[PDB]
Amino acid sequence: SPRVVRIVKSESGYGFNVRGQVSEGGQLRSINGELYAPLQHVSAVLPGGAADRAGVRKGDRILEVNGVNVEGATHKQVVDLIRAGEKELILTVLSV
């Protein structure tokens, strides 16, 4: 089930990495038995960092960034959205 997480930048930034496709759209993939267009995902979480402390986990699939739907998004679109805020990030994630 999707959930919303709020992350406040610390000195180590937010403390997580995102990996995913370069292109927009593409073949549907089932995540937890539900079909979605391709989703960028959390590929690493710094132990003790802001994302870790906020409950973000490696493998989390990213559905929204700062209230903007990023289903099927390009990597660049998701990077730019994560950096949109000066010190706060709100994610809608699906854990696997």
Binding site: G13, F16, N17, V18, G20, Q21, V22, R83
Partner: peptide, 6 residues
């Protein structure tokens, strides 16, 4: 696929 750090 591409990876970025935050």
């Amino acid at each position: 696929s591409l990876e970025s750090c935050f």
